[PDB]
Ligand binder design. Structure first.
Ligand SMILES: OC[C@H]1O[C@@](CO)(O[C@H]2O[C@H](CO)[C@@H](O)[C@H](O)[C@H]2O)[C@@H](O)[C@@H]1O
Ligand SMILES: OC[C@@H]1O[C@@H](O)[C@@H](O)[C@@H](O)[C@H]1O
Length: 718
């Protein structure tokens, strides 16, 4: 039966994962389709309650990785071996058995949301909450799902699909439509002006970036554009749906945000303009009033949230409350805001402050209900007014929202980029990587803005390049490092986006690279015909379980040595043109060192990194045409994600020939065991270099493709 409870014990493929599973914990594998290869778990209690804690069993001697909410809004990672180490507000738990991997997915059921938490007895407790004292229940059958497999990533996906088939209240990442912003460079106003942003600042930032050769094709006009007011350090509330004075044209005050949209798009050649709002309008909601049925509500504190983030008790939102739009009028509110924005030429919204809803369900059916109602409405309005699916979810890491994520396709995957907080950089990289393991099953991760002139610029930039997600800076105008940005952005504003959410390697899933003092974090992704691997030292800082905030902590050495293997890129097979004959050998190109190495299957290459250093590798499967004649494309070697440039690849072994289609421009690189006879671009022979010791072939792709004809056609004649 595979996943089962027998005697006191949760058993997984003849391995005991939990002991002492109490009698009131019930399981079922029945479904709709029907017998399912894991188990839905619930329990029955004596009493009808709005909150229940129940032990699932005792976990000891089993390595795990967890994503837990360290703030209301956001998750980070914790590893361990003992149930006592499972944080409060654990929303995703992955367990390794010495090789089998078990996922634990705490779910929404009816009006209740679940999470996992550890106790001092090493039990894994299921915490069920409605978020409303009037919404009570005594039994549950589907509040947790457990599934096991031999591939850790496949095991997660398969369990999410099974959860999907049960709830039907969300779709998986790959089943949704990505907005077009994800293929272009962008700029966000946030760190440039904070709330002081003006239409003139927006223009100046766009102008300065395009001036250096790296033109953004989207912009996010961040927080500061909306009409907001304090009540008659006081919180601001939304007072109208239209822009404030800073975005009304300088002479004709009846033309509003449309002014800056036209300047962006018509004067500066941007494709997309997005704007920020809170899911409640502004931070203090909407000013009470009848138009949107807005009434003062005060955040309710839940124990697990406040245990991990005590400052949420005395947050400005908690003490001064929000004007919460009525459920009756929430569609009207979003439609009227969004119809105004779209008629002005706005293409999308970055919708922040998402999780507050879970704290405001008191009159209203609870956290799950209110969350669902507000997202149903938001989704109707976005699909109406922003039909490229122009929505970026922000501050949204609760399961209440994830399990109703039926449409939006991009999610901010960590706490904000913090230009002035030295502790935040290593932690940002670890958080985005680990969170993406789980968040990426729902939506494409967004690894946030960053600064091109900053001591950790390269660290952040290189991570964004391998993220799979949107690539955007928040530079103040004129504060740019164009040498860095050319590595990310082509002259037409396009980028070399990888295909998956960037994630830790199998190797790294259970070793905490922020806390263990021992390991390098390795992040893998895929292009069509290469893999890519980023390696990061992010030791020395993490969220402290004692101080309940991010701090520095002691590390044994400055420098650490780990190692790299082709097969660290978990799906590398899929880049091979002939994966049934491939022996697993890869060409491996270090983008910073400019070094090409051939790595046979399983051979390890040492990598040594000090804290806050990184290295990026393009990993390309070698094709063996005939004995002595081997090849692998690398791509645009002066860009971080070099392999992202390769759109087509055909080997013609009977002609000793390679045929590629390559986007972009700049220097193109490939591995060849032999010096080519001719490299031909667009039906003309060109000059090339060949290093005969490494096999590195090199030639220039001069200009972006003439037209419209979006790819360079390249033939390499061996
Ligand atoms: O700026 C206050 C506003 O930001 C949030 C998170 O977006 O809180 C951050 O700033 C607070 C004020 O100094 C801190 O107490 C808090 O821990 C930090 O996350 C919102 O909570 C808040 O309304
Ligand atoms: O008020 C500013 C905003 O809210 C944040 O916490 C964050 O996600 C920023 O990227 C941002 O737009």
């Amino acid at each position: 039966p595979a996943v089962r409870i027998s005697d006191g014990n949760l058993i997984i493929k003849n391995r005991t994962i939990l002991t002492g599973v109490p009698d009131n914990v019930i399981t079922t594998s029945a479904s709709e389709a029907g017998p399912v290869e894991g188990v839905f778990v619930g329990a029955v209690f004596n009493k009808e309650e709005s909150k229940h804690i129940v032990p699932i069993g005792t976990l000891r001697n089993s390595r795990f990785m967890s994503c837990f909410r360290f703030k209301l809004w956001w998750m980070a990672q914790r590893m361990g071996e003992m149930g006592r180490d499972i944080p409060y507000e654990t929303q995703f738990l992955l367990v390794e058995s010495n090789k089998v991997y078990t996922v634990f997915l705490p779910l929404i059921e009816g009006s209740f949301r679940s999470c996992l938490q550890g106790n001092v007895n090493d039990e894994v407790e299921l915490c069920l909450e409605s978020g409303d004292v009037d919404t009570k229940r005594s039994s549950f059958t589907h509040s947790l799902y457990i599934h096991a497999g031999t591939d850790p990533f496949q095991t997660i996906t398969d369990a999410i699909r099974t959860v999907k088939l049960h709830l039907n209240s969300f779709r998986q990442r790959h089943e949704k439509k990505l907005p077009g912003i994800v293929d272009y460079f962008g700029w966000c106003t946030w760190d440039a002006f904070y709330q002081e942003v003006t239409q003139e600042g927006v223009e100046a930032g766009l102008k300065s970036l395009a001036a250096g050769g790296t033109p953004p094709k989207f912009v996010i006009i961040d927080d500061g554009w909306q009409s907001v007011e304090r009540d008659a350090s006081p919180i601001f509330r939304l007072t109208g749906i239209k822009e404030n004075e800073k975005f009304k044209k300088k002479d004709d005050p009846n033309v509003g945000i449309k002014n800056i949209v036209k300047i962006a798009k018509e004067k500066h050649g941007l494709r997309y303009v997005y704007v920020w709002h809170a899911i409640t309008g502004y931070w203090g909601g909407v000013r009470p009033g009848e138009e949107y049925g807005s009434v003062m509500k005060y955040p309710n504190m839940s124990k697990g949230v406040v245990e991990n983030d005590p400052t949420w008790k005395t947050d400005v939102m908690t003490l001064q409350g929000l004007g919460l739009v009525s459920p009756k009028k929430v569609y009207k509110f979003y439609n009227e805001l969004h119809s105004y924005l779209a008629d002005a030429g706005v293409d999308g919204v970055k919708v922040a402050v998402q999780c507050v809803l879970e704290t405001l369900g008191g009159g209203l059916g609870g956290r799950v209900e209110l969350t669902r109602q507000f997202h149903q409405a938001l989704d109707s309005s976005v699909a109406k007014n922003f039909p490229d699916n122009g929505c970026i979810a922000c501050m949204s890491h609760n399961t209440d929202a994830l399990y109703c994520s039926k449409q939006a396709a991009v999610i901010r995957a960590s706490d904000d980029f913090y230009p002035r907080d030295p502790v935040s950089h290593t932690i940002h990289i670890a958080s985005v990587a680990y969170n993406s393991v789980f968040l990426g099953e729902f939506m494409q991760p967004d690894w946030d803005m960053f600064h091109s002139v900053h001591p950790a610029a390269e660290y952040h930039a290189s991570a964004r390049a391998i993220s799979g997600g949107p690539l955007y800076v928040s530079d103040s105008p004129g504060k740019h490092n164009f040498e860095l940005l050319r590595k990310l952005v082509l002259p037409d504003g396009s980028i070399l986006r990888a295909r998956l959410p960037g994630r830790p390697t199998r190797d790294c899933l259970f070793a905490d690279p922020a806390r263990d003092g021992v390991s390098l974090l390795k992040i893998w992704n895929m292009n069509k015909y290469t893999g890519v691997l980023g390696v990061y030292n992010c030791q020395g800082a993490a969220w402290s379980s004692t101080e309940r905030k991010n701090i520095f902590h002691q590390t044994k050495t400055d420098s650490l040595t780990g190692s790299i293997r082709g097969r660290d890129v978990h799906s590398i097979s899929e880049a091979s043109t002939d994966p049934t004959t491939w022996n697993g050998d890869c060409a491996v190109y270090s983008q910073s060192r400019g070094e090409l190495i051939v790595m046979p299957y399983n051979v390890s290459l040492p990598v040594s990194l000090k804290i806050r250093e990184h290295e990026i590798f393009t990993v390309s499967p070698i094709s063996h045409l005939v004995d002595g004649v081997s090849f692998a494309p690398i791509g645009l070697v002066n860009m971080y994600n070099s392999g992202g440039a390769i759109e087509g690849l055909r080997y013609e072994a009977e002609k000793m020939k390679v045929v590629m289609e390559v986007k972009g421009c700049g220097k193109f690189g490939s591995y060849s065991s032999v010096k080519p006879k001719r490299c031909v671009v667009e039906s003309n022979e060109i000059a090339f270099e060949y290093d005969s010791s490494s096999g590195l072939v090199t030639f220039e792709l001069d200009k972006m493709p003439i037209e419209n004809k979006r790819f360079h056609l390249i033939q390499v004649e061996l």
